[PDB]
Amino acid sequence: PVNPEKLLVITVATAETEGYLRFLRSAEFFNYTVRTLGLGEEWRGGDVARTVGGGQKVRWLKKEMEKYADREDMIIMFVDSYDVILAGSPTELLKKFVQSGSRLLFSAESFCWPEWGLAEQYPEVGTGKRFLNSGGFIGFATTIHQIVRQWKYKDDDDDQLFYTRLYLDPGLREKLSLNLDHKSRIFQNLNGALDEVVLKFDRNRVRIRNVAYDTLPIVVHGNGPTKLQLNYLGNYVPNGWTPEGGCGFCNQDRQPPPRVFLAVFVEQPTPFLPRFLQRLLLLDYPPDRVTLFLHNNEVFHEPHIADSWPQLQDHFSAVKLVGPEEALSPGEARDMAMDLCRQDPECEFYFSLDADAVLTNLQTLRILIEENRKVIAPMLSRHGKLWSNFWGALSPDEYYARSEDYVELVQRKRVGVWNVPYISQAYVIRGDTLRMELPQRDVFSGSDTDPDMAFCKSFRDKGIFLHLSNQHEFGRLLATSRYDTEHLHPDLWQIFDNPVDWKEQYIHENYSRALEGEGIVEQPCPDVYWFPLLSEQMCDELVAEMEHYGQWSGGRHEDSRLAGGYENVPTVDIHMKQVGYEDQWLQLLRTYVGPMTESLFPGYHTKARAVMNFVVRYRPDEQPSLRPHHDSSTFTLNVALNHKGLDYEGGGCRFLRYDCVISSPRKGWALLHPGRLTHYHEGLPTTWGTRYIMVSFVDP
Amino acid sequence: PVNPEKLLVITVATAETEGYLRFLRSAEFFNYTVRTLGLGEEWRGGDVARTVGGGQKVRWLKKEMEKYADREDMIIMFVDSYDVILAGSPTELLKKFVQSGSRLLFSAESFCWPEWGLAEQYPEVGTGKRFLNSGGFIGFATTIHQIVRQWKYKDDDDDQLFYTRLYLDPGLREKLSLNLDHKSRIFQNLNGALDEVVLKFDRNRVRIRNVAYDTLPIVVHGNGPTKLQLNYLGNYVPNGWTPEGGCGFCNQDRQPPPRVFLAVFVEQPTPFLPRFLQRLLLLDYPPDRVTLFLHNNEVFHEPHIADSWPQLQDHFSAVKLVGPEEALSPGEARDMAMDLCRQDPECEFYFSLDADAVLTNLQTLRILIEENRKVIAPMLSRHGKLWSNFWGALSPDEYYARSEDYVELVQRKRVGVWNVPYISQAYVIRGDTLRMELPQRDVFSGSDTDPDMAFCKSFRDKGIFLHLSNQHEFGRLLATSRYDTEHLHPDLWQIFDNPVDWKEQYIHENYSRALEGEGIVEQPCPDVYWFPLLSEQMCDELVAEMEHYGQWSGGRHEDSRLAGGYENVPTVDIHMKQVGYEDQWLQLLRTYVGPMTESLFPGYHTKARAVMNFVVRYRPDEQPSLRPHHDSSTFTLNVALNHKGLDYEGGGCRFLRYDCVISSPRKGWALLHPGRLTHYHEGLPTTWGTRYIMVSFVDP
Ligand SMILES: O=C(O)[C@H]1O[C@H](OP(=O)(O)OP(=O)(O)OC[C@H]2O[C@@H](n3ccc(=O)[nH]c3=O)[C@H](O)[C@@H]2O)[C@H](O)[C@@H](O)[C@@H]1O
Ligand SMILES: O=C(O)[C@H]1O[C@H](OP(=O)(O)OP(=O)(O)OC[C@H]2O[C@@H](n3ccc(=O)[nH]c3=O)[C@H](O)[C@@H]2O)[C@H](O)[C@@H](O)[C@@H]1O
Ligand SMILES: *[C@@H]1O[C@H](CO)[C@@H](O[C@@H]2O[C@H](CO)[C@@H](O)[C@H](O)[C@H]2NC(C)=O)[C@H](O)[C@H]1NC(C)=O
Ligand SMILES: *[C@@H]1O[C@H](CO)[C@@H](O[C@@H]2O[C@H](CO)[C@@H](O)[C@H](O)[C@H]2NC(C)=O)[C@H](O)[C@H]1NC(C)=O
Ligand SMILES: *[C@@H]1O[C@H](CO)[C@@H](O)[C@H](O)[C@H]1NC(C)=O
Ligand SMILES: *[C@@H]1O[C@H](CO)[C@@H](O)[C@H](O)[C@H]1NC(C)=O
Ligand SMILES: O=C(O)CCC(=O)C(=O)O
Ligand SMILES: O=C(O)CCC(=O)C(=O)O
Ligand SMILES: [Fe+2]
Ligand SMILES: [Fe+2]
Ligand SMILES: [Fe+2]
Ligand SMILES: [Fe+2]
Ligand SMILES: [Mn+2]
Ligand SMILES: [Mn+2]
């Protein structure tokens, strides 16, 4: 029964990197005792990410080990720290070390590195890993001292070669009782073994299991090109996120606030941009503490920017527009905004936000800052879809890939603050990180690589984690791919691609309340129901689009109305077919008019078929009235599109058999009445101005 | 200027026949002075209708003329009387006689009769008639005496030959100044000249014009086979019927009544026979004075006769049924009934009435008797058609023909009492005529000729006029030709052939009042109208016909109802298609339901299309209810066919959105409600008995 107080973990760290700090938390979770070598020093160990090196680790260990050269009572484990997490206790570790019968147990690995020719000198192992890895080892302090004291090489000579040569000395191997952890009982090196490692869950703890060997490793080493797979595992192992605990290092449940540089990017035609700009004024962060930079690459959006710039300029403490005439690429524009923050010591946080990011959570900026990370993005998804502003995994050549937990995250079955290889569209970056760790100008530019990926790789290459919070609902992602801007009002056509935003803009704000009851729907005449349907903006834009087309009806035009046996009852009008809006209006019918009708006429069921959908214009100088008639419809929908009094004078609809008149219609409100038999009706004369009406003959 | 007081008309008449009396009225109209020879005597003049004869006329004239043998101051005209009418005044006659320059002017005619060989001895006339006719002549009494005194022949030698021989004596012709009225200036003989004679009308008088010669004859002689054309002209000339006077010899404007023998004849299957028998009880003639004979040749009608015979027997003073088992032909049956009257001196009038005669005028029998004719028929027509119970003219071989005034009579543009060659279906014949003038038994039988024609020819052969009154509305003629008796209730199928009777029997007695307003139509629930439609007899017979078929619906049966999205909402029922009544019911829809709907829903128009027309049966032991649903119809018609309380217990129809229930439906009344959208409805459970309902989904 070895005493855990006789175990000492020694690692090397020249800076307190996120990886190093991640290592310590996993150590502190299990009450390990950790000595860190090298914390102030310059790394002279070479480019371990690109080649051989790391001898400086040994040189430092050798010096440290002179204290313990005679301490047979002490067990020491050496591990890297940037790319290591601990998954089990000192008790289970010492139990396993004893069971190995070794005096110094090195980790094992699939590759004979860095001299592939030496493989033949290694003992033949069966199904186990055959070669030594210096990223982790454990043994008596005396034995370890007898190995490392032999170090006499350059700081950038390779440490693993050095240990390999001593391991392959057969007399030394036998005399000192050196061994390798062939079956990853203690040490799990990820390189060459990704398909052997899976997460093993418990109530308040997560581990890894090697499925090749059915073991539960103590130490997870993301050596070589497996740092990002280790990032993934470190989100869980050992207490990153547990089924019963939730995340462990998150802010969980939520006086001058830091000064923020808010940069808005508009790099494609984007729907609902006026709405986005108006939202900037509502973000719950003191505007004297925010300075706004907006890059617009779209001539399409210049009027939209101009309309709201007076308000933005009055709102924030400083504003700057970079417009299409500067001919900046998105890469150059994002480098510029970020560098404007970098070069201002007063810029404490940098907040990048693309025009397709809809932030429903007004406290987003505060929430992200309070998480206190170098880089953190709020999770944003396409409504009801799996597409989102991050990636959970990378392909072998650093392209897109789907992590095994991606759906769990997007669906918020697992919520927390995740270490992911790619984020986009919104993120908050610490000013000091820009100054001290990513000082270059070419963050997004410099290669043919697309900027959004260049950005993420810049941070990954420095070992800066890219964090992603799905801890709260933050907002959504607008669809922008096939946005048709060849309309007077393109957002009218957005009904299929952005239905949630389309409804917020164009459906009446009180529709849903009226659909749910609450005494809003009225019945002005027998079986004629009256409810709010269209917002004023929808009315205005639809009329506008109609006049912009301009081809109103005239003589010899025929509608589906029935009067006086067989006569011709026409209106001056434009059908949806003509302006290319029929599919759109039919969707509004299926989605919003169908369910209201079924609720007002219990027992009736509808798919909201309608062949005749047209806007009617009334004027005293062309066609001011519409004589008594019936409609070819089961029911008729009649929506007012402008204001009685303001835009026209004169009455509206009259139902003759009920001697009931709808005078004073309401803009955006719709009448619902039967089309046949009972509700013979006429449109009263418009006496001044112009009357606009939207009508569909449903279920003909 | 010859003095009319010096003119004397002499004719011959052995009996005061209708023709003779007709002659006198035309004479009295113009104030002629007429001496009649032969009134008491037996006619020994032969068969003038069949051969030569008439010498007795001359013998009597010769005797008469000895008084006037020297009276040069006197002008005498001889004419027949049975077949003669006068059309002009003695003044115009004497004026024309003088203008002829003759001393004795004989009528002229187309045929050299009765010795065709004598034609060559006659003077050549141009376009005029070339030969003598003894039916009319006029001359000085001295000259006429010198001609007739030569008569010394047999009573049945031919008189016209006798005058012809004296005319063809050229010396006598010259010496006595004998002439013929070649151009019908005074005398118009009809035989051989029918196409020369037309009626010429004046305000209060009618004449004839010869169009060959452009003359206005004084004397119209229907000689030979032209008695019936003369009958026709005598209806008008001279004061029979005038444009401003109407008829002249009619009863125009209307204490034991004569005893009548009423004979009813049923010689084919006849629709609405129960109704006809019931009508017999309503004829406004004291039933103690009527004795009823009914011949039925139809086993089809035996139950109908049996049902009402108790009532008939109690009503009239004596009744007699002759039924199918006696195997009488209609001819033998009509001979029998008529002979029962003939042989009863107490039978003062005989009234024959066929089963297809609908007498709407209850005072018919009185009206006909008060006209005081030997034989008289009320005018009866097919509703709205030209077909009627008389003929105005005969073909050359005594078959059917259409008189030139036939349409004027049927349409009652000319009303009066007409002398026509054929009557049928109803007529009143004087008992004394049967006894004294038509004593034979074989009136209708005896030849292959059909009885209806044999009857008329029997009377015509005796010179008895067949009179026809269109002076009042008397009734109508049922159509019987293609009556289908292969139904439990054949009169249900009579909708197309006898619509007026069908409506009186099967349409509700208060329908038309309700169609016209008058607060009968109710609106028990919003836009559900309630009106009387079917009589109780129609309800009973339709249900009966339905059960007689018996093939009610069951499982897997599908109707055009809409509920709960897509589900199966069926009834236990029989569609009209199945019992062969759909065309019928569709007509009832077009004729009675269409117009009511258009009046209750102003602005709506209908041809009353309906694919689904079915009777529903409700019972607690099969299908007692009908769950909430909509109908595939613009509007639905729902007619109750039996009595709540008497035939069933339990509620009826409920309209869910109006929380309005039609409990207690009315037998024969119909609901009218929209089929779609607003009027979701269910049929409440029938809890005792059986519920029958008639339903059509109109305008699907
Ligand atoms: O020198 C080593 O220890 C190993 O480095 C690489 O493999 P790798 O595990 O990916 O190296 P890292 O884990 O990225 O860095 C090695 C350790 O050196 C320390 N280090 C490294 C770099 C640095 O700037 N500061 C610093 O403290 C960290 O503990 C770091 O984990 C080489 O491929 C191995 O052959 C070599 O044995
Ligand atoms: O004897 C005649 O006077 C003529 O009778 C027929 O021609 P029609 O004019 O048709 O004879 P009717 O008019 O039917 O009868 C002749 C007249 O005799 C009188 N008459 C005849 C029959 C009779 O039973 N009682 C009677 O009084 C009537 O005035 C009767 O009109 C013959 O065809 C002629 O040749 C003949 O000249
Ligand atoms: C949506 O419904 C709200 C609640 O009834 C409406 O609100 C009122 O607006 C009137 C004038 O516009 C004010 O005088 C009231 O004080 C408001 N009431 C509340 C509770 O805020 C609102 O007008 C409706 N929206 C539209 C577009 O009609
Ligand atoms: C047709 O309408 C008449 C008039 O309203 C109905 O007549 C009444 O019938 C009730 C009972 O049947 C009597 O008590 C009233 O005295 C009647 N009124 C008159 C004015 O006669 C008649 O019932 C209706 N016919 C049907 C078949 O419903
Ligand atoms: C770590 O040590 C503390 C005593 O300072 C003890 O209370 C705690 O339970 C230990 N945690 C574990 C996981 O052993
Ligand atoms: C017939 O004679 C009477 C006199 O008795 C005379 O009043 C009447 O006008 C005459 N009618 C005609 C038509 O001459
Ligand atoms: O002017 C109105 O409100 C009635 C017009 C109407 O209902 C129609 O389009 O047929
Ligand atoms: O039982 C009733 O009165 C309602 C039945 C009905 O309307 C139907 O035939 O669909
Ligand atoms: Fe139109
Ligand atoms: Fe309309
Ligand atoms: Fe059915
Ligand atoms: Fe129904
Ligand atoms: Mn490492
Ligand atoms: Mn004659």
JSON list of C-alpha atoms and ligand atoms in Angstrom, two decimals, chain B residues 508-511 513 520 532 534-536 667 669, ligand 4:
[
{"chain": "B", "resi": 508, "resn": "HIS", "atom": "CA", "xyz": [-97.47, 20.83, -49.19]},
{"chain": "B", "resi": 509, "resn": "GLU", "atom": "CA", "xyz": [-100.72, 22.79, -49.33]},
{"chain": "B", "resi": 510, "resn": "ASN", "atom": "CA", "xyz": [-99.00, 25.79, -47.71]},
{"chain": "B", "resi": 511, "resn": "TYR", "atom": "CA", "xyz": [-95.83, 25.78, -49.80]},
{"chain": "B", "resi": 513, "resn": "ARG", "atom": "CA", "xyz": [-98.23, 30.73, -49.53]},
{"chain": "B", "resi": 520, "resn": "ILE", "atom": "CA", "xyz": [-94.75, 31.14, -42.76]},
{"chain": "B", "resi": 532, "resn": "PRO", "atom": "CA", "xyz": [-93.39, 23.52, -45.55]},
{"chain": "B", "resi": 534, "resn": "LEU", "atom": "CA", "xyz": [-94.12, 18.01, -48.85]},
{"chain": "B", "resi": 535, "resn": "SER", "atom": "CA", "xyz": [-97.67, 16.93, -48.14]},
{"chain": "B", "resi": 536, "resn": "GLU", "atom": "CA", "xyz": [-98.26, 14.14, -45.66]},
{"chain": "B", "resi": 667, "resn": "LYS", "atom": "CA", "xyz": [-93.54, 16.31, -40.95]},
{"chain": "B", "resi": 669, "resn": "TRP", "atom": "CA", "xyz": [-91.15, 20.62, -43.53]},
{"chain": "C", "resi": 4, "resn": "LIG", "atom": "C1", "xyz": [-101.85, 25.35, -43.84]},
{"chain": "C", "resi": 4, "resn": "LIG", "atom": "O1", "xyz": [-102.07, 26.66, -43.25]},
{"chain": "C", "resi": 4, "resn": "LIG", "atom": "C2", "xyz": [-103.31, 26.77, -42.53]},
{"chain": "C", "resi": 4, "resn": "LIG", "atom": "C3", "xyz": [-103.45, 28.22, -42.12]},
{"chain": "C", "resi": 4, "resn": "LIG", "atom": "O2", "xyz": [-102.50, 28.59, -41.13]},
{"chain": "C", "resi": 4, "resn": "LIG", "atom": "C4", "xyz": [-103.29, 25.81, -41.35]},
{"chain": "C", "resi": 4, "resn": "LIG", "atom": "O3", "xyz": [-104.52, 25.89, -40.65]},
{"chain": "C", "resi": 4, "resn": "LIG", "atom": "C5", "xyz": [-104.86, 25.72, -39.32]},
{"chain": "C", "resi": 4, "resn": "LIG", "atom": "O4", "xyz": [-104.81, 24.38, -38.81]},
{"chain": "C", "resi": 4, "resn": "LIG", "atom": "C6", "xyz": [-104.90, 24.31, -37.38]},
{"chain": "C", "resi": 4, "resn": "LIG", "atom": "C7", "xyz": [-104.71, 22.86, -37.00]},
{"chain": "C", "resi": 4, "resn": "LIG", "atom": "O5", "xyz": [-104.38, 22.05, -38.12]},
{"chain": "C", "resi": 4, "resn": "LIG", "atom": "C8", "xyz": [-106.24, 24.88, -36.92]},
{"chain": "C", "resi": 4, "resn": "LIG", "atom": "O6", "xyz": [-106.34, 24.83, -35.50]},
{"chain": "C", "resi": 4, "resn": "LIG", "atom": "C9", "xyz": [-106.39, 26.31, -37.41]},
{"chain": "C", "resi": 4, "resn": "LIG", "atom": "O7", "xyz": [-107.69, 26.79, -37.09]},
{"chain": "C", "resi": 4, "resn": "LIG", "atom": "C10", "xyz": [-106.19, 26.38, -38.93]},
{"chain": "C", "resi": 4, "resn": "LIG", "atom": "N1", "xyz": [-106.23, 27.75, -39.40]},
{"chain": "C", "resi": 4, "resn": "LIG", "atom": "C11", "xyz": [-106.93, 28.13, -40.48]},
{"chain": "C", "resi": 4, "resn": "LIG", "atom": "C12", "xyz": [-106.85, 29.59, -40.83]},
{"chain": "C", "resi": 4, "resn": "LIG", "atom": "O8", "xyz": [-107.59, 27.34, -41.13]},
{"chain": "C", "resi": 4, "resn": "LIG", "atom": "C13", "xyz": [-103.08, 24.38, -41.85]},
{"chain": "C", "resi": 4, "resn": "LIG", "atom": "O9", "xyz": [-102.92, 23.52, -40.74]},
{"chain": "C", "resi": 4, "resn": "LIG", "atom": "C14", "xyz": [-101.84, 24.28, -42.74]},
{"chain": "C", "resi": 4, "resn": "LIG", "atom": "N2", "xyz": [-101.74, 22.95, -43.31]},
{"chain": "C", "resi": 4, "resn": "LIG", "atom": "C15", "xyz": [-100.83, 22.04, -42.93]},
{"chain": "C", "resi": 4, "resn": "LIG", "atom": "C16", "xyz": [-100.88, 20.72, -43.62]},
{"chain": "C", "resi": 4, "resn": "LIG", "atom": "O10", "xyz": [-100.00, 22.29, -42.05]}
]
